[PDB]
Design a protein around this ligand. Structure first.
Ligand SMILES: [Mg+2]
Ligand code: NA
Lengths: 42, 167
């Protein structure tokens, strides 16, 4: 991890939201590449 | 007072210096005792490529007692109940559930931490604990038909990740 924890509740909540979003989008992007590999094979 | 101070300290440490593959914290700080987690499935396992939501629920006297941990998606693993409850020794104080866990296994204490809990979950995903069977169907398959176990886990991982959206 690599962000300093912000000093207000709203900023912390927004940073956490953003971190979850980034993790989810990256995982979905990896899975899309795997699926495309497989759809190609059929 | 003590519990909220301790939870903030762990949240700060996790945010600033936490391990790869884990995001955890209170999405709503008006309920600081409920944390949302995302756990990346470990590479080299059938969980690779999965990303799993989970909830930690802390007691009001944390760290004197352990939180509970539940996956919030369909999950197939020997040490996870069908309702998503995670069965690992670190979530139990010494003496609680002696029939379930090895006595060499770490137990809850006030110096344990959320990071240790979640690293232990990662380890359990890579290597199930054979004494603490919680899902009898997954226990049987992992031991007797590991190839099929991997197939089930991979299929579920793609299904539940398809249901995972930022919110
Ligand atoms: Mg909110
Ligand atoms: Na709370």
């Amino acid at each position: 991890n690599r962000s300093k924890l912000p000093s207000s509740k709203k900023e912390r909540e927004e940073l956490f939201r953003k971190r979850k979003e980034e993790m989810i989008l990256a995982a979905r992007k990896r899975m899309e590449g795997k699926i495309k590999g497989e759809k190609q094979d059929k | 007072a003590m519990a909220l101070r301790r939870l903030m300290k762990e949240y700060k440490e996790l945010t600033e210096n936490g391990p790869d593959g884990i995001t955890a914290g209170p999405s709503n700080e008006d309920d600081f005792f409920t944390w949302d987690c995302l756990i990346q499935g470990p590479d080299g396992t059938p969980f690779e490529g999965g990303l799993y939501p989970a909830t930690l629920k802390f007691p009001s006297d944390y760290p004197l007692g352990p939180p509970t941990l539940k996956f919030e998606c369909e999950f197939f693993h020997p040490n996870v109940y069908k309702d998503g409850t995670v069965c690992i020794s670190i979530l139990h104080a010494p003496g609680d559930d002696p029939n379930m866990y090895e006595s060499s296994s770490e137990r809850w204490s006030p110096v344990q931490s959320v990071e240790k809990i979640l690293l232990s979950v990662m380890s359990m995903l890579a290597e199930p604990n054979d004494e603490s069977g919680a899902n009898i169907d997954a226990c049987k398959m992992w031991r007797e038909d590991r190839e099929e176990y991997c197939r089930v886990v991979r299929r579920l991982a793609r299904k539940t990740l398809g249901l995972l959206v930022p919110r």
